[PDB]
Design a protein around this ligand. Structure first.
Ligand SMILES: *[C@@H]1O[C@H](CO)[C@@H](O[C@@H]2O[C@H](CO)[C@@H](O)[C@H](O)[C@H]2NC(C)=O)[C@H](O)[C@H]1NC(C)=O
Ligand SMILES: *[C@@H]1O[C@H](CO)[C@@H](O[C@@H]2O[C@H](CO)[C@@H](O)[C@H](O)[C@H]2NC(C)=O)[C@H](O)[C@H]1NC(C)=O
Lengths: 49, 49
């Protein structure tokens, strides 16, 4: 019991760590079509649709 | 009479007031595990299959 409870606790805090870093976004926003914002080419940082 | 496992609640004077058959259904298998008659919403760990 102690073992199972120990590993599940260690495992469950790995999902807490991932949401604490990434999930700071309240709304999903769309990818704009314009990526040369004043010449600033942003095609590499954005996802390729 | 069968060799099963029960959990027994004792009052202030040692009267068995309530019992849970630990092999009845997966709900009652959980109450025997966590030592409670009332269990909060979520996922809890129980025995392996
Ligand atoms: C911004 O950078 C992208 C690369 O991320 C450039 O896109 C490439 O353009 C060349 C020229 O036709 C193509 O052969 C490549 O296939 C393109 N890359 C991709 C991933 O499609 C883009 O040209 C740059 N912007 C400007 C204004 O030069
Ligand atoms: C355990 O037994 C005692 C008796 O010694 C109970 O105390 C009595 O309880 C009744 C009603 O519950 C009261 O009317 C009496 O006045 C109590 N007597 C004394 C001396 O306090 C006690 O209630 C029992 N415990 C439980 C949980 O029922």
């Amino acid at each position: 019991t102690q073992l199972n409870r120990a590993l599940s606790g260690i495992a469950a805090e790995q999902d807490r760590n991932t949401r604490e870093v990434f999930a700071q976004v309240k709304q999903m926003y769309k990818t704009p079509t314009l990526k040369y914002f004043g010449g600033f080419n942003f095609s590499q940082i954005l996802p390729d649709p | 009479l069968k060799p099963t496992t029960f959990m027994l609640k004792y009052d202030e004077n040692g009267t068995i007031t309530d019992a849970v058959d630990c092999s009845q259904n997966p709900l009652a298998e959980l109450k025997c595990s966590v030592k409670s008659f009332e269990i909060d919403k979520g996922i809890y760990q129980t025995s392996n299959f």
